[PDB]
Design a protein around this nucleic acid. Sequence first.
DNA 1: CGGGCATTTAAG
DNA 2: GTTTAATGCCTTAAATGCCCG
RNA 3: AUCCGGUAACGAAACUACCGGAGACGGGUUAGGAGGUGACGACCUCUAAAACCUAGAACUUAGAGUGCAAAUACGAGUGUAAAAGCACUCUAAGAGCAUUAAA
Length: 609
Amino acid sequence: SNIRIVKRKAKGFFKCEDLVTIKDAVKAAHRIMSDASILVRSYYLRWFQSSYPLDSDDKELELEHFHISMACSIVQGITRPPVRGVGPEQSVKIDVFNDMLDEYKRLYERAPNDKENETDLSLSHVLAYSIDNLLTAYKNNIEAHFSKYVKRFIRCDMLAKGFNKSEANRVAAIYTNAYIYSSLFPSKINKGGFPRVYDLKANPWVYLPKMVMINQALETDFSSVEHKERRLLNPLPFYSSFVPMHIRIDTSGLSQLLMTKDRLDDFKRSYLAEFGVSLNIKNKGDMLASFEKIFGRKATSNREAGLYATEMWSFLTNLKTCRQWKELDGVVRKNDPKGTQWMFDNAVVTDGVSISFQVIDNSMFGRKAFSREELKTSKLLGCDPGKRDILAITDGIKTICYTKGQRDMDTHKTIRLRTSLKRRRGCGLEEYETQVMNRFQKRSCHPEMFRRYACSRKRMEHMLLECYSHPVFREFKFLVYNKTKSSEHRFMHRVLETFKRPQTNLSKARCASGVMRMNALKEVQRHGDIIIGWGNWIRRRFESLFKTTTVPEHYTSQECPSCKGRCLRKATGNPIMRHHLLRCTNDSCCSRWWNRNVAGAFNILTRLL
DNA sequence: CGGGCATTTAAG
DNA sequence: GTTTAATGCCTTAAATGCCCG
RNA sequence: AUCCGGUAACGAAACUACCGGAGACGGGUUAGGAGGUGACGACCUCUAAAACCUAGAACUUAGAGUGCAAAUACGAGUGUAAAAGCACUCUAAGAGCAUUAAA
Ligand SMILES: [Zn+2]
């Protein structure tokens, strides 16, 4: 959609007297969701043993908003049913609420207490987006990773059947593709006869029981197999990181937290004086009513209502007076053909240290209702992507690569590791975290194993949260975001200054054929006049200045520019089997020695030309 | 002897 | 510890629990 | 102790060796540049900073500007006398993020 973000620091945006509440809210929200997520996961596994294989006479357990909302209430110590009024349809809520409450009494090894989980902020609206995000994560995990569970089970089933792991991939690969497009799948859902892969999107809750069983089978059925091959998956996501997470603040959410009667009454005077209209507000109860009730008549258009929302932010924040206002005041970017004008969307995502502003197109501002000839002159380049070496660009005579170490130095990986360990060791958490919680695997789907991790953490939860709340940890998150741009931008600049001029030598490379030299003599003065051949597999930022095209990667690691076939193979017959040394298999070759970076790039460039 | 304020839930 | 794939981007009326000059 | 370029054994690999260059998150405190005598050096002075402490700022690349840091000649043997780096403003090109899972 037409929604974009501007990420900056939060200093100066919120007033000092209001910044205290925001920081407390971030900690309070994290604690509720982090503990609530564990409670929800524990309850599901209790019901998991109710039925497998799935019975045909009952429906599966499907989570909804009220499920998580009740979990949050239990964590905060609210033991009374949340049902408003009484009704036969609402009776189901009461039964579920008591069922989860009893689980809380057993998940933790001591009687619940109400005053140990005190909170004093109206986080009802803020937690709403977090609950939706958590439930969305459940759907995404189930609907987009089932095939990966199949691979793990099958590649362990082969080992259990006596096959050495050399043959496991031989059969597993075909089985996975064939079955997706043996007993790990449910009954066909779609009556239209579409392939089995389609059924995964029909309903995630049907496939969820299978994934849990796969985890239990990996832990019990395949216990004899090597633990390295049985690295556990996580069917049920939950918030684990102790670092406070970002929260979403809207016009309604901001109003609830930072508004009081003595402050709300001033809003009426300021609005009346500047606009000559008195708002229909008496107390905090009528603050967030509809526009028609507030002004007494229907708005002419959505934009009129939106302007009222912006004034709400203006009175409570320095939106129109802070440093960041420069980038939100109707900014138009120079090279947009449509000339889209952007303005603030009355929404903020922040974590106390960093703030992200939401900016939308001016054509939709308001309250939202629920619902090839250049190849002749262009200079060509070729590169083969990878992971040990991220990129390797060549012009046929010279090579440049974007090594992993380059980004590590740019992002200060070593310094960040040292600082984090030093701070943790000061509080004494190193001994407990490295020894106690290391053994207890949180990803385990066994009710016993998960309970032990949950209860062990509860004894050190308070210490852990305070230690990780230090701003140093949150500052590093901004640093990696900022420095990642610098590393890629510098490399892009280096590419231009390397191939911007003709090569000074045309004989160093023996394998350089006649075709290669033709593309090296052209001069190019602009980023957009360079075309880089790329593999099928950072590229998304490269395309912002450089033009790119796709070349097949098949057999590019063995083919040779000037040979009848794939003469290249990894070196063998030496004391040390090194990483990627390449050696030719026959004398009829231009170069008897090669490496993956040069070999792969040259073949791609040859195909490009 | 009365009236008033602030959370929170619900469907949309 | 880091990268890729996936989803998302929200408003307003009524119940009730509490409070004190 | 990592990164960049070259040398060898018909483009060597996280070590097979050698030669030339870059860099250490922010705030406190350290050694290096430069100056009364723009001799030399002694003390002082402007700037600045690795190991240690610390609830702690900041959209990114190319270039262009302004603006910094000041208190051996003569009279008869003998007395007087711009560097490292930083800040601001410009021109050109870019500019959506939160969470989970997976490898
Ligand atoms: Zn060959």
